[PDB]
Amino acid sequence: SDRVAQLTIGNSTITTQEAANIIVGYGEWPSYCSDSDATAVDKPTRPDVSVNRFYTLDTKLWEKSSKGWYWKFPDVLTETGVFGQNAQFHYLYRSGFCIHVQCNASKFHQGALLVAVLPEYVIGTVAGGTGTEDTHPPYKQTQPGADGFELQHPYVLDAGIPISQLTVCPHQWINLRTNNCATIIVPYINALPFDSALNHCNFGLLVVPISPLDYDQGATPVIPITITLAPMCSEFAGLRQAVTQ
Amino acid sequence: GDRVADVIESSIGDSVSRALTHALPAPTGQNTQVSSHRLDTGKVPALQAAEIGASSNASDESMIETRCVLNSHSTAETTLDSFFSRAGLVGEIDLPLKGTTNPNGYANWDIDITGYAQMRRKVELFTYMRFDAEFTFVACTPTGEVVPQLLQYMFVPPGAPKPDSRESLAWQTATNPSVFVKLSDPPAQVSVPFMSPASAYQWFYDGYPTFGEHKQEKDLEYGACPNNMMGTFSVRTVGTSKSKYPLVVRIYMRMKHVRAWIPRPMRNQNYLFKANPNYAGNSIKPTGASRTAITTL
Amino acid sequence: EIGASSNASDESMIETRCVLNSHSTAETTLDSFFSRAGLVGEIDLPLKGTTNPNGYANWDIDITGYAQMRRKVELFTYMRFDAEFTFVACTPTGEVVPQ
Amino acid sequence: LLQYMFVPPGAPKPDSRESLAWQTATNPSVFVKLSDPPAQVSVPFMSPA
Amino acid sequence: SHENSNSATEGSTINYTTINYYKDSYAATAGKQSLKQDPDKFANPVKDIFTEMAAPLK
Amino acid sequence: SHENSNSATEGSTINYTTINYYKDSYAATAGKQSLKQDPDKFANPVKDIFTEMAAPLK
Amino acid sequence: GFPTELKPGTNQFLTTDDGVSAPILPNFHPTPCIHIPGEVRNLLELCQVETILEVNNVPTNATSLMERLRFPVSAQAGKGELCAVFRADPGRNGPWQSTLLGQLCGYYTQWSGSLEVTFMFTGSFMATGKMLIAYTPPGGPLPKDRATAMLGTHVIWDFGLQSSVTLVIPWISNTHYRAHARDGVFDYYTTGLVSIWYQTNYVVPIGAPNTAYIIALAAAQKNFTMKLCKDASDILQTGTIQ
Amino acid sequence: GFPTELKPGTNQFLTTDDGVSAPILPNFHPTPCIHIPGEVRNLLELCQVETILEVNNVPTNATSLMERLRFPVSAQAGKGELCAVFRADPGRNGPWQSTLLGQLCGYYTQWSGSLEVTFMFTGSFMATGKMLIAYTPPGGPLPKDRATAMLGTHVIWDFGLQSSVTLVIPWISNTHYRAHARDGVFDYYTTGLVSIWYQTNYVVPIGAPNTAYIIALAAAQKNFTMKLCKDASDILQTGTIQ
Amino acid sequence: GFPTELKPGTNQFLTTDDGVSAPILPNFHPTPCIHIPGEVRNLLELCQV
Amino acid sequence: ATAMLGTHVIWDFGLQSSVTLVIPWISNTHYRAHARDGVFDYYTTGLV
Numbered sequence A: 001s002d003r004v005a006q007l008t009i010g011n012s013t014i015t016t017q018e019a020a021n022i023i024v025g026y027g028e029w030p031s032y033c034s035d036s037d038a039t040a041v042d043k044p045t046r047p048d049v050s051v052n053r054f055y056t057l058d059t060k061l062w063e064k065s066s067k068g069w070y071w072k073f074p075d076v077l078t079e080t081g082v083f084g085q086n087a088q089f090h091y092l093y094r095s096g097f098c099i100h101v102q103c104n105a106s107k108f109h110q111g112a113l114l115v116a117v118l119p120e121y122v123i124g125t126v127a128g129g130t131g132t133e134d135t136h137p138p139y140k141q142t143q144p145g146a147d148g149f150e151l152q153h154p155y156v157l158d159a160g161i162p163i164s165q166l167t168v169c170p171h172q173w174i175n176l177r178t179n180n181c182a183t184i185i186v187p188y189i190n191a192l193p194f195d196s197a198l199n200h201c202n203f204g205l206l207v208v209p210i211s212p213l214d215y216d217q218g219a220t221p222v223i224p225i226t227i228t229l230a231p232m233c234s235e236f237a238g239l240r241q242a243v244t245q
Numbered sequence B: 001g002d003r004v005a006d007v008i009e010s011s012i013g014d015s016v017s018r019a020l021t022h023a024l025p026a027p028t029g030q031n032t033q034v035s036s037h038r039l040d041t042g043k044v045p046a047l048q049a050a051e052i053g054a055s056s057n058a059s060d061e062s063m064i065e066t067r068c069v070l071n072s073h074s075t076a077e078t079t080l081d082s083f084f085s086r087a088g089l090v091g092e093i094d095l096p097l098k099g100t101t102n103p104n105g106y107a108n109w110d111i112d113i114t115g116y117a118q119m120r121r122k123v124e125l126f127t128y129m130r131f132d133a134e135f136t137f138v139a140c141t142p143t144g145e146v147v148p149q150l151l152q153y154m155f156v157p158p159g160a161p162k163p164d165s166r167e168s169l170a171w172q173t174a175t176n177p178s179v180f181v182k183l184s185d186p187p188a189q190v191s192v193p194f195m196s197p198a199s200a201y202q203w204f205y206d207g208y209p210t211f212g213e214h215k216q217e218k219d220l221e222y223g224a225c226p227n228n229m230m231g232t233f234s235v236r237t238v239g240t241s242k243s244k245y246p247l248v249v250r251i252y253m254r255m256k257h258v259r260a261w262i263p264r265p266m267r268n269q270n271y272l273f274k275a276n277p278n279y280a281g282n283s284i285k286p287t288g289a290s291r292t293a294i295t296t297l
Numbered sequence C: 001e002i003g004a005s006s007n008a009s010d011e012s013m014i015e016t017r018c019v020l021n022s023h024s025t026a027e028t029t030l031d032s033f034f035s036r037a038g039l040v041g042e043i044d045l046p047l048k049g050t051t052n053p054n055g056y057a058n059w060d061i062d063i064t065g066y067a068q069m070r071r072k073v074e075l076f077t078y079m080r081f082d083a084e085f086t087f088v089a090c091t092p093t094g095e096v097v098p099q
Numbered sequence D: 001l002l003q004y005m006f007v008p009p010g011a012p013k014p015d016s017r018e019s020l021a022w023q024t025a026t027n028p029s030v031f032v033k034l035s036d037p038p039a040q041v042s043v044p045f046m047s048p049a
Numbered sequence E, F: 001s002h003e004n005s006n007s008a009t010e011g012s013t014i015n016y017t018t019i020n021y022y023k024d025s026y027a028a029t030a031g032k033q034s035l036k037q038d039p040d041k042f043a044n045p046v047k048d049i050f051t052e053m054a055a056p057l058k
Numbered sequence G, H: 001g002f003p004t005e006l007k008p009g010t011n012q013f014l015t016t017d018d019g020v021s022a023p024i025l026p027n028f029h030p031t032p033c034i035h036i037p038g039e040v041r042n043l044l045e046l047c048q049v050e051t052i053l054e055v056n057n058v059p060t061n062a063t064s065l066m067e068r069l070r071f072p073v074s075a076q077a078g079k080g081e082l083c084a085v086f087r088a089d090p091g092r093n094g095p096w097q098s099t100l101l102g103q104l105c106g107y108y109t110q111w112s113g114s115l116e117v118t119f120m121f122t123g124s125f126m127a128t129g130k131m132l133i134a135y136t137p138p139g140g141p142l143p144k145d146r147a148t149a150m151l152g153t154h155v156i157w158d159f160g161l162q163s164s165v166t167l168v169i170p171w172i173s174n175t176h177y178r179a180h181a182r183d184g185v186f187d188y189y190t191t192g193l194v195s196i197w198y199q200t201n202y203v204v205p206i207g208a209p210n211t212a213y214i215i216a217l218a219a220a221q222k223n224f225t226m227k228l229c230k231d232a233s234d235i236l237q238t239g240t241i242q
Numbered sequence I: 001g002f003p004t005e006l007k008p009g010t011n012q013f014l015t016t017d018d019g020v021s022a023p024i025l026p027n028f029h030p031t032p033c034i035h036i037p038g039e040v041r042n043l044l045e046l047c048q049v
Numbered sequence J: 001a002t003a004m005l006g007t008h009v010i011w012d013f014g015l016q017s018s019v020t021l022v023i024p025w026i027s028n029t030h031y032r033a034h035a036r037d038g039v040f041d042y043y044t045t046g047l048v
Ligand SMILES: C[C@H](CCOc1ccc(I)cc1)CCN1CCN(c2ccncc2)C1=O
Pocket: B111, B112, B113, B114, B133, B135, B154, B155, B190, B192, B201, B202, B203, B204, B228, B229, B230, B233, B274, H024
């Protein structure tokens, strides 16, 4: 009754029989930009169903030694379906997201993944080890696209901050003995009403195993983790030719 | 006009962001109510499901027999203004006589407060912050001595000409705000408004400032957001000749009328650079003290 | 040719949305623009010199010797106003002496 | 010019004239010259008792 | 007073009681903020709220 | 106050809200000006005004 | 006396401080103010007045300076050829520096609003033609061809009795205000690009010039405002003005 | 002029003085504030959010840091063996330093209120067990055995569909507020000890891991408040930050 | 500014002067005062013992 | 990734042994005739 659930949006429907409720980040639902917060004057385009639907972009394999991964939004979708096109043809973009991380196992497996959403997830580098070299993360590390990227030092979230406090952000846990998915709804988060879907990543999705995956020899060893997400209340403006970056 | 049903009944355009929580008044800590033994089935406050993502709702009253306690402890000292409205060092500007830095009697300081750990760690607890501020300028020689020297501080907003010398024409300051004061006077002090083009400054910007390819040589710009760059603060000794004394200017900032959004984990590795969260990889230390065994203090 | 600026607006050239503009026009009023103290004169009183080595000096009240201020006021042909004058004195190194 | 700073129990005590603790971001500090009149401030009742 | 409304908090859900002498409100003191709080925004942002007495996973 | 009227703006279409301590008004602050504007004076000083919709040369 | 206590700021001189100062001439009454035409109350009033935009800002020798005030059009080869281009950034070095809007803009750190450029064709009466004037919002690189330019905000101008056409550069920004844009991280505040193409062709009969010019006039819309007063980038003085 | 008289304090600069200072930009209006999710009004709001408590704070090499976030349980010999222990002092060096509560706590000299620690079992679904989690108020030395621990405030946790259990560390002090406790005379403000014992045993069938981990999440109750603002004990900077 | 004029006494520190001084800890609330036996209000109370 | 761009359902095994995929009527014509290889593939419904 809180364990079962169906998420239908657009022409896509998701089901789960082992859920742990739903989290609505910062207590508020995605909403379209009001006429008072807005500043751009052109009439926006709100594709609706063609872009606000569930997209299943990537699958990683959870292992006894995995460190964790992260994806940046809306970077992950900028090259997929009608959403991608609108994000490319338009200068301005804004939307919310419904994130559904999937991972099932057996009643004999164990482990716990922390699934969180961290706004303005700026990545740092190890500074050449000694901290004397002022290195910087490459485009492929800041905006990893759909394949996401693996954390080098999860304890500090590759940014000099404790993962132990990441729970201060909208999150859920995927404890195998309890559930097989996490569901987080996120509203538009920025200090501006609209922004570039290309140059700015509003937040990052983190999937990190805090309690190591384990099982005995003989149990299915391939435990996938799939990422499905749906934009919500997508709005675009400032039309012109398509641009990938 | 709209005729097809799906259009009439759509929610496309709702600008009213539905909120699930509302703020209540809490001037004091919650009181404790009396409670007694409960030997029930079905009822189970102690049992939780952290997976959901919420903190425990279990209270003192439901876990043990409690007495009544009228809590009058105030929550006033933990408000944003109470926490941040305390002047702290955010800049130091040297004006030496014989030196390698500013031996010309003037100096330009980029307005960035991330060069000092104490202040920096506090503000980085939040992603976005909107506030006004009170700046105080303490000047003296390097020994802390006070000398009869007249100085001019000038705010050079982005786009205004940065003085290139002690005799620059820009010191005419016809439009820029300037402050003339002696080292003998008390510290200069002024109020600054919230000047960003954005609704709030942000200590973290996960993106690039421009479009195009982001090749190696341009990665210095990852995380740079012009909305946080308020301009330059220039200082000079007021004269066409070099000053007879070496000077030091300490800049203190005290925020006021503060608003913050999106809390984040707090820095646990030493800071290295102003512009980024880079940390020393060979020296990743735990967040705190450690011990020999989990079963011993 | 008529001599007037275009009357064409955003609404009539493209499909626009509604935007409630609350941006203020206060900082562009005349007082906001001009009521900022700027340098308009420098008077030297040197000891051993070619100019005023007599301990006194006469300055003709004319503020057109300084570009910044001058260019601002010359945007208008006629101007009527009151003014606040501030006199900053010191030695050439910027030192303060009991004089 | 002098700097007086109140270091409550648990705050880092400066170990030198150049200590980082003098950044005084949260502790209350008073900057004053020996030439100024005596510094003066009001202190509340701070005990846990 | 009859001053400008340039304070960074102009129009906040929490009203302030401040002091000022200039025509620009942002020059005012920090004053006293209002003591409201909303822990649930961060500590319990769940859609279908669950009781204390009941078991969280129904 | 009961002072002289020596301000350079005495009798202006835009009223001011100022502060003063002396008997001569011109010593007062700059205060706040009134926010009126008349762009047409410079941007459209035509005798027979022409509509936007219509063609300017009828 | 009454107990007071001096606070920091004491004795300082802030050039923008709006305070009270003692009057030098007590009981002095100024000369009455008669009526004078053209009183201006707000700089914004001046920003709505069109001035000549030097789109053709290439000639530099004294004798050819007047050529910056106008660019040409002429019979082409019907391949939707490019006529001219320029950035729409009003407070940026370039064509806009010739306008009063651009200069006044230099006295403010941030601006916000829609801009407008009116193009007046000064060819002969017998000359006809259609042009495509486009505005490419941020992120869009200089359109390689007309087809690409046509994908953004644009106007198709037809020569006729009405010598002019107005291109509106609607306010399309992410931030409520833009600061003066320039090469570097501040290109974040760039407004975009304006390109002019031949939609049809400059056609003329026997007896009329094969080349005519266009004069561009620019100004701001009524939603334009500026803020955070600052000194202009230029100081028109080398040595001392005597 | 009006008769005044300067009092002590004149000219001093108190960093916490809340006074008025002259505005540098007259008539300047800030950019309007749009709606932004997650506004926080009081640090106490953050103290009620659970963060990971590093009960297992022993590993120090970089490659094993993530192991501090969780401690283990496993099949025993049914002798009510001890699983783990830690001080409940929130503002004391130790496990609490990993929590946001502990860090925010460092910015205040005194605190008051009940704390709570929620333990989440991450073993397999087929694993069962009962644990005894006890809180020993001041004066009680580290319980030598379960029987001794059981004499104080405690909870008996049963593994099941509900993965977690919450131990409440009720406010039991002599003083209304406690200052940060540490070795020495300041141990006067110590909160106490938390010990975890096996009530029954970690039982598992054939085919499931003999070792599973527990993740501890801590935060404060709604009667928690802090006072007497102070600088944190750490300053994350060695030399100058460039 | 407002016309003032300093009088003798300016800058002096009188140990018995009962004036106002800036608070070091804004918005700080002291620990509540519980009931304690034997409160004395005036030294004269002690003189009668 | 390509399949996911159309109408779909994500099925989770559990107490409920079954899941229902709906093949909504998405045609250009009001009716479809029996589709087969050739010009009559015009009436094809699609792929699952
Ligand atoms: C309060 C300062 C602006 C101070 O502006 C003035 C202006 C004039 C004067 I006189 C004194 C100070 C802005 C501080 N901020 C805004 C955000 N920011 C920043 C720095 C580094 N990385 C991200 C943001 C940052 O350093």
